[PDB]
Design a protein around this ligand. Structure first.
Ligand SMILES: *[C@@H]1O[C@H](CO)[C@@H](O[C@@H]2O[C@H](CO)[C@@H](O)[C@H](O)[C@H]2NC(C)=O)[C@H](O[C@@H]2O[C@@H](C)[C@@H](O)[C@@H](O)[C@@H]2O)[C@H]1NC(C)=O
Length: 228
């Protein structure tokens, strides 16, 4: 097998998922990335990551996989205007452990390029209020403004595609009730950024205070890699 495909209409404990840091599945079937404390309130300065347990094959040899992933989430904060830090969809080395917290979203360690992070991520930067497409670097390759401070607090549907033919990544975000849309596009050669097999999933980090913290819950997720 070269082609992977799964579908979580909701989450459960017995699922093919690897949870790291404070991430847990709620009794309602929700993937709570940054977690909830003993008093059931969002955790401050919390990091939680979660990946499909099977590694995914990006490079077959010469042929690169194309992929399509759809997921929907909700970020709820006490004060969204000051919410931090965000949620990430990332391709990482297979058993990589969580990196740094805060603005590092648990996927990076430095303010400098990390060519050996072998990570490619799409961050819904709730801190800086934009959508970032990061390539082995915490500083975005291409970023687009998206008003999370205003439209968060509602199901948001994300759709991410990668076509190895034109080597383009396309992200389409849609806030479901406010109806607001955001999107960014970049030209990437996945094969030059990540390994032949990677772990696919999410990683979020919450603010260092009761006011700046928020939730990062994923309510559903689908994925399909394809070797054409
Ligand atoms: C998971 O949730 C905990 C909060 O509900 C995090 O602990 C908090 O970490 C702060 C420093 O990052 C520290 O000042 C807080 O006092 C502490 N709160 C509690 C209740 O422990 C936890 O962070 C990890 O665990 C703490 C104890 C420290 O050792 C940190 O260095 C750890 O990262 C959250 N994050 C993770 C990744 O578990």
């Amino acid at each position: 097998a070269t082609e992977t495909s799964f579908n979580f209409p909701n989450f459960h404990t017995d699922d093919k998922l690897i949870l790291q840091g404070n991430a847990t599945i709620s009794s309602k079937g929700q993937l709570q990335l940054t977690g909830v404390g003993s008093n059931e309130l969002p955790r401050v300065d919390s990091l939680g990551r979660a990946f499909y347990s099977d590694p995914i094959q990006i490079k077959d040899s010469n042929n690169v996989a194309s992929f399509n992933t759809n997921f929907t989430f909700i970020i709820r904060a006490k004060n969204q205007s000051i919410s931090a830090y965000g949620l990430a969809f990332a391709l990482v080395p297979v058993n990589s452990p969580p990196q740094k917290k805060q603005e590092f979203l648990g996927i990076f360690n430095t303010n400098n390029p990390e060519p050996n992070a072998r990570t490619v991520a799409v961050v819904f930067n709730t801190f800086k209020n934009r959508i970032d497409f990061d390539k082995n670097f915490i500083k975005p390759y291409v970023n687009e403004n998206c008003d999370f401070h205003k439209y968060n607090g509602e199901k948001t549907d994300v759709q991410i595609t990668y076509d190895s033919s034109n080597n383009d990544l396309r992200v389409f975000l849609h806030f479901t009730v406010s109806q607001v849309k955001c999107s960014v596009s970049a030209t990437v050669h996945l094969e030059k950024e990540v390994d032949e097999w990677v772990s696919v999933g999410f990683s979020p980090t919450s603010g260092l205070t009761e006011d700046t913290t928020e939730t990062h819950d994923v309510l559903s997720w689908s994925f399909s890699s394809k070797f054409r």
